[PDB]
Structure 1
């Protein structure tokens, strides 16, 4: 013996592997279908019908019931983005990049875009709110270490837009998700923690510029910050990087973006 066998050198071990690739090949198929719940339904438009196409190995749904009085959601993307975008053609073959119809950031298109998202504060385990201002919660306390509260936030150009006032924290997961900037006009605006550096001497926002600051879309409400506003602040904050430094392109290198 050297591997017992059935019909023509096809052993019990041989049986095992043909069977494996017989159904795993199917697994990929399933999870790939399951993977395209969103997006993939409607990339075709009825200005003219189908002779071109819209892929459809697409699955049969179920419904995510949102705990918080939220409701029921069917994710197979019945998507109709009802918002506007400032963009238009630059040639007729769809792969070509198609320009912003006048500055992005103010109306968000390109790398600095936000998106509609049920205009209500994020789910906590408890019905309570999630992200809540440090100046308003049961004992949260950065101890002896550099809480940026009394130092000027500063962008690319100058430190003349930098009254830091209070950290803005996530209550369950204990993380400081926001720094609050009382802009030179008593306007509190927040910034996404990751995109700013806190040197024990100043807060550097290599993300944006001294200006462009007084634009981060106001959280029009004092305490409750939220999606339509949360995806918006980060969105316009991102508008630095690509669209900030006037220099519309440039080879790069390690240390702070080209510096000065």
Structure 2
């Protein structure tokens, strides 16, 4: 009858849909590799999809996925076992080297632009008309690390102009230079900003940005990866 026909029709449609969906989610990170980087023999049941091409705004070219994958940076790790499946030990400083939870991806050394072609993120001192409108203004507060020591003070907020939100604190260190701190990794309090991820001695190691009025997508990743990695790698200096 007509209802059994409808419910068989649907299950076949759903099989096709799941297939389409699984292959759409294969457009990054494939083909699979062995831990030495050569292509794995077994790539799974579904094949790769035909490539698609994104036209990027503002004259920044195209992207085609799937397409040639390369880390485009050195990975300072070594095998800890003789068979597949075990962890890879850092061979140096995992925070200096950008591995594990401190990892960064080699994105474009360009800033993200808004719908008009201007830099998305600007320090507030250069964003006309932008001010703190609610909450505690962190500018001027000292910054405390997880070792309960003071590493610097907030000298600006870097803001998302089109989305009107704070994205980075700009911290001045005891030697006069500044670093960016992700907003999502600080705790603003009445009389201080507290940073759980980093101990005070690790602030100088935060990657620095090359022009002082803009931050590129690559530097954003290095900064954020570094700060997040301190949760694992700076635990020998965390207190309650």
TM-score by length of 1: 0.85
Structure 2, unmatched stretches of 5+, are none
The alignment partner of 1:94 has SS state of: coil
Matches within 5 A, 1:33-112: 33-44=23-34, 57-112=47-102
Q: Structure 1 residues 112, 126: CA separation in 2 closer, same or farther (over 3 Å shift)?
A: same
Deviation digits for residues 29-88 of structure 1, max 9, x if unmatched? 011111111112242589988766576511111210100110011120410222101111
The list of structure 1 runs, each at least 4 consecutive aligned residues, that deviate by more than 6 angstroms after superposition, is 45-50, 247-250
Q: Structure 1 residues 248, 52: CA separation in 2 closer, same or farther (over 3 Å shift)?
A: farther
- Ranked by relative contact order (alpha carbons within 8 Å, sequence separation 6 or more), the top structure is 2
Q: Structure 1 residues 58, 120: CA separation in 2 closer, same or farther (over 3 Å shift)?
A: same
Q: How many residues align?
A: 240
Q: Structure 1 residues 55, 107: CA separation in 2 closer, same or farther (over 3 Å shift)?
A: farther
What is the alpha-carbon distance in structure 1 between the residues aligned to residue 37 and residue 164 of structure 2? 50
The alignment partner of 2:77 has SS state of: coil
Deviation digits for residues 70-111 of structure 1, max 9, x if unmatched? 001112041022210111111122211111112200111101
TM-score by length of 2: 0.92
Aligned residues of 2:95 and 2:230 also touching (Cα < 8 A): no
What is the alpha-carbon distance in structure 1 between the residues aligned to residue 202 and residue 36 of structure 2? 39
What is the alpha-carbon distance in structure 2 between the residues aligned to residue 56 and residue 168 of structure 1? 44
What is the alpha-carbon distance in structure 2 between the residues aligned to residue 48 and residue 189 of structure 1? 38
Structure 1, unmatched stretches of 5+, are 1-10, 251-260
Q: For the aligned residues, what is the CA RMSD?
A: 2.4
Higher strand share: 2
